[model samples]
Target chain A: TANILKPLMSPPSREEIMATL
Target chain B: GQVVADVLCEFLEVAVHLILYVREVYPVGIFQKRKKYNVPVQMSCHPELNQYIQDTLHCVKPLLEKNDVEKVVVVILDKEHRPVEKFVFEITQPPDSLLSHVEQLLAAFILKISVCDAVLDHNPPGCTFTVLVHTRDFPWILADEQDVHMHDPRLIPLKTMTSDILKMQLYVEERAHKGS
Candidate 1:
């Protein structure tokens, strides 16, 4: 079970923006 | 954790630190129990995990270097999260019994704190954690948690408040040393 938090700075990859939450 | 980017950054941070600050040592202590156990006893023939062990030692080096007379005890827990052995240390090569005992207690306390912190973090609530350190001893205890409940509880409870957690334990072998 993993949750990925998107990068706060520049544009993030699709995975980064996707959070399990 | 993301396989790319975020996870990669974390891994890179570890890798860079390993190369820059860590020494190539053996059987790199992964199980905190094993690491703590090896500290007091001599390291017999065992596999090498030098890089990992060096990282563990670096974690506590600051505290050891700062104090006048310091004893550090750590508990090494196996993969199953059970307390295994104790690692005891004094700044001096051969520490006395009182110092050793204190070190053991300190290690237990630190381990408890770590476990509690982890428990409060995620789902399914795992019990085990490992250490990374390189030492002549296979698994030395830097600190561990006492088996008894509330021997020394965490200063802060999760939620509703935010503050740093601080732990302090001091031993007095003799009064004469205080003036110095």
Candidate 2:
């Protein structure tokens, strides 16, 4: 029942999104 | 009763926008009121945001069809680009939760998200979110990089929906504020 998960690759960060904005 | 992954794909569309709306990722004005799964929901009208989610979901549905995708996350980051909140959608191998109508079951799930703001911490204006698809390694249809890590997260389980075939649980994790 180990339902919590981790990403295999780096997920999108706020920094990345804000960079474009 | 249908292509179960398609239901997952459809729900994700509504869920993503609701996450943005309820979490205040964008102003409410940019969202248009709409009905989904027999429930009222706020969907984003912003072109870029709409396209981003559509693209992400489009990629994910295939993995979902193959049962390669395990979970999807809506990660929220703070002003410092640190992860402050995570909305985790856990997918299981079609578990059990007896339902009324598929649409009604979906509406039940939607209701939980709608009321979550009252049950969790509020994120101020500076926070932003990104969608993450968690799948098996080398599962193709994919990346590398650096990102935020949640240390000592607090998990608040919200809703669980088990339809004709697929089962999913919606939960939120909030990072503890710096002040102890």
- Interface root-mean-square deviation of model 2 in angstroms is 7.5
Q: Which 10 consecutive positions of candidate 1 chain B have the poorest summed lDDT?
A: B171-180
lDDT score at residue B4, model 2, on the 0-100 scale: 62
Highest TM-score model number = 2
Superposition error at B102 for model 1 (Å): 22
Regions of candidate 1 where Cα sits further than 4 Å from its true position: A1-21, B1-48, B92-180
lDDT (Cα, tens digit) per residue for candidate 1, span B68-130: 224333323233334332222222322145434544443443343333424321211122223
Please report the TM-score between candidate 2 and the true structure.
0.79
Model 2, span B19-71: residue lDDT tens? 88898777677789999877899997766677777776777777788887778
CAPRI grade of model 2: incorrect
Residue B62 alpha-carbon offset, candidate 1, angstroms: 2.6
Binned by DockQ into CAPRI classes (incorrect, acceptable, medium, high), candidate 1 is incorrect
Taking every candidate in turn, the Cα RMSD to the unseen true structure, in Å, is 19.4, 5.2
> How much is the lDDT of residue B123 in candidate 2?
78
